[PDB]
Design a protein around this nucleic acid. Structure first.
Ligand SMILES: [Zn+2]
Lengths: 199, 108, 187, 147, 1012, 184
DNA sequence: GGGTTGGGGTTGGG
RNA sequence: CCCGCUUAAUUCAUUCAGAUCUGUAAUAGAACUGUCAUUCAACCCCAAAAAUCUAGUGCUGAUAUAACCUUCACCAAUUAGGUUCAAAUAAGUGGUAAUGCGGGACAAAAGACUAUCGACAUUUGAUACACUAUUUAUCAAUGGAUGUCUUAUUUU
């Protein structure tokens, strides 16, 4: 209706005033995320009291378009669907590989085991390749093929050579390796503390 | 430059010349080079052992002595891995001696 | 036992033949001047594929079998067989040409020949092929030469083909010349 | 212009008659029952160390009938030797300088030396009989083709 | 700078090629090697032969040929023997000029063909040269060197060395191609819609028989495991089953439906076919227009294809997003012009591989080697897309639609329903079987011709109010041993008729064939017009209607038999030519071979055994050059013979028993010669030249009987008669209409586009409809009858221009393709009527202005297609132009360099060499400024260029303006130095520069140029 | 190369020139003053020399020449011809590359010549101008030939083996018949 | 038992 | 503007050829079956350009009488107003796409996180595998990255 469209334009202007979108900042997301600050009318139908002015979505679309063409704070052209304002108004398992050809790069040994298909962390040093996992099931699921039952020998192919590996590291060495992962993981902590202290 | 003729003859014709420059060919006889023709063998002057090891066949240019002995002036050898035919060689020599073809090999 | 004939008799009995006649002879010739201005090979399937579907990207697919095939190279040369009487331009096909290529260089296999030639050519190594072919000049042989009085594009023409290429044996050629010359003097 | 097999004595007689009777046709072709330009011959090839001859390397072909003197050629862009003679040098160095018969095709024109186009080493005496018979046969063939 | 000069010596040009280490004439080479001495005597002929002959060598070999004093140079051999010994020395090497038309066997070389350059090797000059060298050095001079001997004012002939045409020449994967060209011209139509009965959807129909009919896809070499093969076979069986559940009738009715009054049109066409007596005419025009106004729009068939694919192929076969992208690109696939096409990469580079779910890997490289996995799966996705397109989209279009282009629309594409095209075919058969074609039974044709020549085919192009037939003779009879189409049989007679054509320019009529001849005639007429004092001019234009169907076979054969311009026996020689291109000499990076300068062209020619004055028997070629720049020719060993009797037989056949097929029913002409043959284009001009010569006697003397200039030109069809006396134009029209009445043809549409008006009653010309205009609009030209300056007519709207450009862009060699395309699109038509004799200075500037304004619009689609691919992902271009905004710099580079080359070529075309250099520089800068101004003003409004490229282009244009001003400002001082004396043209140039006030700005000139 | 010379259709040229010869001959000698007719028939003296036109310029390959009997032999694929030439100037004018034999010539102009011999006539062919255009060395094995220096037997030989030779021999016989019937 | 040499590209007049 | 789902019904017509049926005055109507084709489809003449394109600028000081910038669909043409070597607010024309439903709070100058990660995240160089317009991996270097809270109320 005429009074209905007038009240609709009045409420849309009262809720479109940048002071409201600054004290509440609700419509700020719709304003920013809009393509060119031209939001559509499909977000106006989700209002609470706007439906109370109802007393065929294109019909109400054209009604609001008329009530906006009679207004000046906002803008509407070509009877399009979107609407816009005429001002910016801004403001437990780990093992070890051994007998690796000395000097071989990290890439070969890490990919030969990444062939497993499951993640792991590897530390290489001249032969000793300490490998650890995050999941306990993957150990028993992988040893079924990495420990080749054809030979029943823990052997991996690297750079054209056979290399040995152990299925269990000592328990005291396991505790020391856990404490070493703590050392390096707490080393991150001391790094970051020094970075926070340099100023 | 200098024409040193050296015709070829059979074994019997060696007795017909009795001193002249000729060229005769033969196969080595295994035990003073000595070679068997064609069983009749002929003896010569070259050092029997001096020739190379692989060589099995020989051709000599020289003057024929009284009989069965010939001083060799030119010595040719080759590793003939195949049995040297003889009857065709005799036919060729006889045709060389033929009157219809004598005007090809030697003068007159 | 066979009966031989020189190149003159072949050229004669060829230029006095009506269309549709084929004939074979045996000659004590020798090969020379393997031509190289043509292409030195062609493609053929294993099942006597007449036409091979050509593709791009070196793709191949036969039609007499209708399976994806590994293309086979049959090399065909062209050279001249001559003698103390004449000369004849002949064509050499896969088997004979491979036999020759293998005799001059025993490393290459009788079935590896075409692939060797094609790889040398396409890679950019023709000098080696040129020298290899040059090493065959005046190589004595025993040939079985076939001639056919066919007709192409309604134009009569004589073509010579080589069937058997064997190593020579002077002991028999000598006897042949001797008997021929005996017959010649006797009459 | 076809190849003819003949021996050294025939070459000597032919060149002698050519140099003695210049009242022939004014063509480089010799005359022996026809106009021939090439020749085939099996003979005892041996080098002939001439004096200060850069391009040419004189040779010699002894035989059971006479003796001729041939000339070889060498590449101009590279002062080296052809293949068929390099192989002969190698083979002669191996056996320790023992001269062998060879079968040679050579081109002879008049009022010039006798070049040697190609030759191959022979290791079979049946080649000698083959060459003699070829000579006689082709001679008879040309003679009875003249009549 | 490195401008283009109009005169060059082959010795100078050869010095620039880096491969050749030593080049010189033969005389200096003989003085260097001491083979002769200036104190000796040599006749003039031999000394000139030693001075002009040029030799080249890839190595400095003057030392190896030094005179060895060991033995004097007395030669006893002939020349043939020395050359034979040289060819023997070559051995197995198979590319040498002295080796053409011969074969080496053993130690004997034999000649088997006609190398027309042997005359040069065995002449007396080469005999004396052999005497000078001696055999042992001649035999290697014929090998180590390249010997070009001058035989023509500028043309050289190569007689010895390596063939120059030998200097003009690990793998990767190559995706298949989508056979788009299959969709265009299909005249078939079945009872029920769908696809052909030979397609795999209908083959004897079990996945087994599908494997049987898809034996080309089930066993590709991209499927890793048999598992994948079976997995894909399942999808194909589901595709087939889904296809058999489509009712094409409802689909066609929904999107692309027949008109509302189709039954009316069917009845009208059936009625016109039935009536034996001739029907009306304008009704047929209205019916053709009502039929052609039923073409299916692009959106309609696009929706049709999307809808038929959506319910024929499973979604996951390609992936949820791959399928979406594919359906989106299908539109672009629909609306592309005739000779355009899409590449598989267009789809691939915008799709994702990890979206296809049913893929598998034998080794688990999805994490180790991700790139190799993406490659190995792209190699499968591409084949999937090619299969989909070339097995569903192509047959459906080819079967249900007829796709072709309109007469005037150019290269645009149009889709017609199948029934409507069958109606058009019926109506055209009716409208064509009454005038010239007629049905025929294979009884009447003689069997000798029937087994000798092949047949032809008919096509129909829709026209405004009628059709346009086309006869194509590409087919050949595989059976009966016919391995050549009819054009390949008539090639030799076409060569003879070209030889004839070279003599019809001035002997038996008024014919023209190319823009060079037209421009020469115009230059002469403009000279005479300026001589007489520029009086008023009149003109008249008219054209025969359907010439090729109006010529009488009897009169043509009679004119053929009794002509003396056609000899009895001709020999055909084939050779090849290296001519000079437009690259300026690179003043002296060190890798410059021949093709940087010379263009290779393989040519044939037919000469006569007579003692003709062209003496082709000595040279072997006939080239008419337009400048004094060298060119090389080498002959070839491929001669042929042709006889007037064979040409007579071919003419009689193609003029009497020419039978062409259509819809498997045969037709045969009744009068005229078939357009579509290579030979007809000259035959028509000859036949009409005879007739028009019979009736135009008064023009032969009307230049001196009363002192009146008058030009008369004619292409195969169009006349143009410019004159000074209206009476001559009236007499011309009268005589031409009289000849038309006498011989049986009539002029097209009775439209005479004259310049004056006159009472059409005093001459019985009432039936003509005179149209009066004030500018001669001849073939794509606008001759201005007040200044008689010529230029072309350009389209005005971006759509009209786009209708005739087929873009084809490949990432492989963009840099060359785009530059060549610009160079051509500039120099296409402008290069001929840029003659400084025809147009004045302002005329040339205006012509360049308008032509550039047209060519920029022509080029624009190439730029918009280039921007559709990002180059940063291509190392080949990112290493050279950067990683950010690389397209901008690439386009700027190609634009700049092509514009510079075009400016240099224009300066070459406008001036001579005697002109000062500063004038050339000023005009080069002026043309560069004009072109850059046009480009900048045309692009400154677009979007893809608005951001950053326009700044570069504006900078370049401002720089060119500044350089032009600076040259114009320094020319005054340089001339006032008085060291230089000016000819007349330089004074004209100065007058043009100072009048328009090019010191301050171009503002005074643009009004005189942009005015249309 | 064999086809290039084959396509020349030389026999058409020979037929046309023979036709022109006999036509002009019995056109120019219709006086029939029997005293002059007896005066004309003398042994070994040309009765009529007809030059050929400029359209009959065929080419061929020289296979063998003879300088004492001035004889030339040419060939083209199938057929070979035996003809004469006017003098040594004919050879020395055509710039031969190496030698008369084995070279491709074009005949700029030739001529027919009519002789009276024992009891009958004889029509020869004389080549008057040549030019060497190239060298070709390809022995052609011509099955059949025609000799213009042996009267009627020179042509009528091998007449059964080819239609063209049959027709030309027939025309030659008709020509000599008309010849002997006009004067005698 | 092989055989012009199959092309790539597609503007502007007729 | 982005993301997920969805978008429908009988035949608008049936050329050519073959075999059936129905009545007739020459037509018609019913219903059926086979189907691109010389294995291939592409019209011709003439004229213009031609690098194995990592190889190329006087890399550019000009005419505020100038050059840029400004519009809610998109693009391409027409008018208004500002700026001084670059930045933000417009108005008439012509063509092109348009079913509905649902989501679009970090906005940021930091503070707190000892939450995190030798499995953090960038940046570069090196090495692999790839390349016709690849969306990776390891090493080295480097320091910051992540998830939560505070400055915050659907008349939105
Ligand atoms: Zn097969």
């Amino acid at each position: 209706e005429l009074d209905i469209k007038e009240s609709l334009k009045l409420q849309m202007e009262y809720y479109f005033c940048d002071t409201n979108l600054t004290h509440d900042s609700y419509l700020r997301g719709i304003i920013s995320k809009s393509p060119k600050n031209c939001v559509d009318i499909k977000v106006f139908l989700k209002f609470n009291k706007i439906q109370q002015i109802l007393k065929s979505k294109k019909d109400l679309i054209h009604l609001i378009r008329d009530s906006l063409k009679e207004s000046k704070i906002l803008k509407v052209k070509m009877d399009s669907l979107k609407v816009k304002r005429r001002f910016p108004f801004n403001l437990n398992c780990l093992i070890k590989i051994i007998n690796i050809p000395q000097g071989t790069l990290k890439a070969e040994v890490v990919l030969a085991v990444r062939h497993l298909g499951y993640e792991f962390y590897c530390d290489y040093i001249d032969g000793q390749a300490m490998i650890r996992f995050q999941n306990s099931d993957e150990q028993r699921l992988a040893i079924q093929k990495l420990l080749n039952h054809n030979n029943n020998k823990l052997q991996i192919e690297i750079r054209g050579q056979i290399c040995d590996v152990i299925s269990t590291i000592p328990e005291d060495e396991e505790k020391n390796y856990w404490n070493y992962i703590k050392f390096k993981k707490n080393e991150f902590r001391k790094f970051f503390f020094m970075k926070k202290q340099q100023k | 430059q200098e024409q040193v003729m050296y015709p070829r003859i059979l074994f019997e014709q060696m007795a017909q010349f009795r001193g002249k420059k000729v060229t005769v060919v033969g196969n080595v006889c295994n035990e003073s080079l000595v070679i068997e023709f064609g069983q009749h063998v002929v003896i010569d002057n070259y050092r029997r052992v001096d020739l190379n090891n692989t060589t099995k066949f020989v051709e000599i240019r020289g003057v024929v002595l009284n009989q069965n002995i010939v001083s060799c002036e030119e010595l040719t050898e080759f590793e003939q891995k195949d049995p040297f035919d003889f009857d065709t060689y005799s036919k060729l020599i006889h045709l060389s001696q033929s009157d219809k073809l004598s005007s090809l090999f030697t003068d007159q | 036992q066979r009966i031989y004939s020189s190149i003159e008799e072949i050229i004669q009995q060829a230029q006095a033949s009506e269309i549709g006649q084929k004939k074979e002879f045996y000659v004590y010739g020798n090969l020379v001047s393997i031509q190289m201005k043509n292409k030195l090979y062609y493609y053929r399937c294993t099942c006597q594929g007449k036409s091979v579907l050509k593709y791009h990207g070196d793709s191949f697919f036969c039609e007499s079998c209708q399976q994806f095939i590994n293309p086979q190279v049959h090399l065909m040369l062209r050279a001249f067989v001559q003698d103390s009487t004449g000369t004849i331009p002949v064509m050499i096909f896969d088997q004979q040409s491979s036999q020759l290529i293998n005799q001059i260089d025993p490393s290459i296999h009788v079935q590896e020949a075409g692939q060797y030639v094609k790889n040398c050519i396409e890679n950019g190594q023709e000098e080696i092929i040129r020298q290899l072919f040059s090493k065959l000049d005046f190589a004595r042989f025993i040939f079985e030469i076939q001639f056919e009085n066919k007709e192409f594009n309604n134009e009569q023409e004589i073509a010579y083909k080589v069937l058997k290429i064997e190593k020579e044996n002077i002991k028999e050629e000598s006897k042949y010349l001797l008997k021929k010359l005996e017959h010649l003097i006797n009459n | 212009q076809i190849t003819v097999p003949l021996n050294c004595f025939m070459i000597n007689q032919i060149v002698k008659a050519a140099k003695e009777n210049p009242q022939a046709h004014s063509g480089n072709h010799y005359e022996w029952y026809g106009a021939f330009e090439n020749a085939i011959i099996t003979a005892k090839f041996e080098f002939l160390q001439s004096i200060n001859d850069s391009p040419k390397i004189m040779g010699k072909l002894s035989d059971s009938t006479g003796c001729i003197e041939v000339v070889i050629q060498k590449s101009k862009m590279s002062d080296e030797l052809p293949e068929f003679v390099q192989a002969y040098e190698i083979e002669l160095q191996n056996n320790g300088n023992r001269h062998k018969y060879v079968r040679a095709m050579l081109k002879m024109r008049k009022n010039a030396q006798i070049q040697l186009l190609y030759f191959s080493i022979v290791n079979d005496a049946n080649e000698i009989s083959r060459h003699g018979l070829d000579l006689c046969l082709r001679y008879l063939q040309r003679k009875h083709g003249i009549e | 700078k490195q401008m283009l000069t109009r005169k060059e010596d082959l010795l100078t040009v050869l010095k620039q090629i880096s491969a050749l280490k030593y080049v010189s004439n033969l005389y200096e080479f003989l003085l260097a090697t001491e083979k002769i001495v200036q104190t000796s005597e040599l006749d003039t002929q031999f000394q000139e032969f030693l001075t002009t002959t040029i030799i080249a060598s890839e190595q400095n070999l003057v030392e190896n040929y030094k005179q060895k004093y060991n033995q004097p140079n007395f030669s006893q051999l002939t020349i043939k023997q020395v050359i034979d010994d040289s060819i023997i020395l070559l051995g197995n090497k198979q590319n040498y000029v002295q080796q053409i038309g011969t074969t080496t066997i053993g130690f004997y070389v034999e000649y088997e063909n006609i190398n027309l350059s042997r005359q040069t090797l065995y002449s007396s000059n080469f005999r004396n040269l052999l005497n000078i060298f001696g055999e042992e050095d001649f035999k290697y001079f014929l090998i180590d060197f390249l010997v070009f001997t001058k035989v023509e004012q500028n043309g050289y002939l190569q007689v010895a060395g390596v063939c120059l045409n030998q200097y003009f020449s690990e793998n990767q994967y190559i995706y298949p191609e989508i056979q788009r060209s299959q969709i265009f011209y299909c005249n078939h139509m079945g009872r029920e819609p769908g696809v052909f009965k030979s397609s795999f959807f209908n083959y004897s129909e079990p996945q087994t028989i599908i494997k049987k009919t898809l034996l080309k896809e089930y066993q590709s070499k991209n499927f890793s495991c048999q598992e994948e093969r079976d997995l894909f076979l399942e999808f194909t069986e589901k595709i087939v089953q889904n296809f058999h559940n489509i009712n094409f009738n409802y689909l066609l009715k929904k999107f692309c439906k027949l008109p509302e009054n189709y039954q009316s049109l069917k009845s009208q066409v059936k009625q016109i076919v039935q009536s034996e007596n001739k029907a009306n005419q304008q009704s047929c025009e209205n019916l053709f227009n009502s039929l052609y106004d039923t073409e299916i729009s692009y959106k309609q068939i696009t929706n049709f294809l999307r809808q038929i694919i959506q319910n024929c192929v499973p979604n996951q076969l390609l992936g949820k997003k791959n399928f979406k992208v594919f359906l989106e690109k299908l539109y672009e696939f629909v609306q592309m012009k005739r000779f355009e096409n899409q590449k598989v990469l267009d789809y691939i580079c915008f799709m994702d591989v990890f979206d296809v779910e049913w893929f598998v890997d034998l080794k688990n490289q999805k994490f180790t080697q991700k790139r190799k996995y993406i490659s190995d799966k792209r190699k499968i996705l591409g084949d999937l897309i090619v299969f989909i397109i070339n097995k569903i989209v192509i047959p459906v279009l080819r079967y249900n639609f007829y796709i072709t282009e309109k007469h005037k629309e150019g290269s645009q594409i149009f889709y017609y329903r199948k029934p409507i095209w069958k109606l058009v075919s019926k109506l055209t058969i009716v409208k064509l079987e009454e005038e010239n074609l007629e049905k025929v039974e294979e009884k009447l044709i003689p069997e000798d011709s029937f087994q000798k020549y092949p047949q032809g085919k008919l096509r129909i192009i829709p026209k405004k109010g009628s059709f346009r037939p086309i006869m194509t003779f590409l087919r050949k009879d595989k059976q009966k041993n016919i391995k050549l189409n009819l054009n390949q049989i008539l090639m030799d007679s076409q060569l003879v008729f070209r030889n004839l054509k070279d003599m019809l320019g001035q002997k038996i009529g008024y014919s023209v064939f190319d823009n060079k001849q037209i421009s020469e005639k115009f230059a002469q007429f403009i000279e005479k017009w300026k001589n007489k004092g520029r009086p008023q001019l009149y003109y008249v234009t008219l054209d025969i209607k359907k010439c090729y169907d109006s010529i009488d076979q009897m009169k043509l054969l009679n004119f053929f038999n009794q002509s003396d311009l056609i000899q009895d026996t001709y020999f055909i020689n084939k050779y090849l030519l290296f001519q000079r291109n437009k690259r300026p000499l690179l003043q002296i990076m060190d890798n410059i071979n021949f093709p940087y300068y010379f263009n290779l062209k393989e040519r044939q020619i037919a000469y006569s055994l007579y003692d003709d004055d062209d003496q082709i028997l000595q040279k072997g070629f006939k080239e008419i050059q337009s400048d004094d720049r060298p060119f090389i020719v080498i002959n070839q060993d491929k001669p042929r013979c042709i006889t007037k009797d064979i040409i007579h037989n071919h003419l009689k056949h193609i003029s009497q028993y020419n039978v062409i097929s259509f819809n498997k029913v045969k037709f045969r002409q009744k009068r005229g010669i078939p357009q579509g043959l290579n030979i007809s284009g000259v035959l028509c001009s000859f036949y009409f030249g005879k007739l028009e010569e019979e009736y135009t006697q008064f023009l032969k003397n009307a230049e001196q009987v009363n002192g009146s200039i008058n030009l008369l030109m004619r292409l195969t069809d169009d006349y143009l008669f410019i004159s000074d006396s209206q009476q001559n134009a009236l007499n011309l029209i009268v005589q031409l209409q009289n000849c038309a009445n006498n011989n049986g043809f009539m002029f097209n549409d009775q439209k005479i586009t004259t310049n004056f008006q006159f009472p059409q009653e005093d001459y019985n010309l009432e039936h003509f409809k005179i149209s009066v205009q004030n500018e001669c609009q001849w073939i794509g030209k606008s001759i201005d009858m007040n200044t008689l300056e010529i230029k072309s007519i350009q389209k005005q709207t971006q759509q009209e221009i786009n209708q005739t450009i087929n873009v084809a862009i490949s990432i492989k060699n963009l840099k060359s393709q785009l530059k060549n395309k610009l160079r051509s699109l500039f120099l296409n038509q402008l290069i001929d009527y840029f003659n400084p004799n025809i147009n004045s200075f302002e005329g040339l500037c205006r012509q360049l202005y308008h032509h550039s304004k047209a060519t920029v619009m022509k080029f624009y689609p190439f730029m918009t297609k280039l921007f559709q691919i990002d180059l940063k992902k291509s190392k080949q271009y990112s290493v050279q132009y950067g990683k950010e905004n690389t397209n901008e710099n690439f386009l700027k580079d190609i634009l700049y360099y092509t514009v510079e080359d075009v400016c240099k070529i224009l300066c070459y075309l406008q001036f001579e060499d005697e002109i000062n250099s500063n004038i050339k520089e000023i005009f080069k800068n002026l043309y560069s400024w004009i072109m850059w101004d046009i480009i900048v003003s045309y692009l400154k409004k677009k979007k893809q260029f608005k951001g950053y490229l326009n700044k570069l282009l504006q900078k370049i244009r401002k720089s060119r303006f500044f350089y032009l001003k600076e040259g114009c400002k320094s020319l005054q001082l340089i001339l006032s130095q008085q060291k230089y004396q000016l000819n007349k043209k330089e004074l004209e140039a100065i007058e043009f520069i100072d009048l328009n006030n090019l010191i301050q700005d171009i503002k005074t000139l643009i009004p005189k140029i942009s005015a249309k | 190369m064999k086809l290039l010379l084959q396509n020349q259709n030389i026999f058409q040229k020979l037929k046309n020139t023979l036709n022109g010869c006999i036509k002009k001959f019995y056109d120019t000698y219709q006086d029939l003053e029997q005293m002059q007719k007896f005066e004309m028939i003398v042994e070994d003296k040309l009765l009529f020399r007809y030059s050929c036109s400029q359209s009959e310029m065929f080419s061929a390959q020289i296979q063998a020449h003879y300088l004492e009997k001035r004889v030339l032999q040419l060939t083209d694929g199938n057929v070979k011809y035996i003809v004469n030439f006017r003098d040594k100037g004919v050879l020395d004018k055509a710039n031969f590359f190496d030698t008369p034999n084995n070279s491709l010539v074009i005949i700029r102009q030739w001529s027919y010549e009519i002789y009276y011999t024992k009891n009958t006539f004889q029509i020869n062919l004389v080549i008057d101008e040549m030019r060497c255009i190239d060298i070709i060395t390809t022995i052609f094995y011509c099955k059949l030939e025609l000799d213009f220096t042996q009267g009627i037997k020179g042509i009528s030989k091998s007449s059964s083996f080819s239609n063209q030779i049959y027709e030309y021999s027939a025309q030659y016989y008709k020509a000599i018949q008309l010849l002997k019937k006009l004067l005698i």
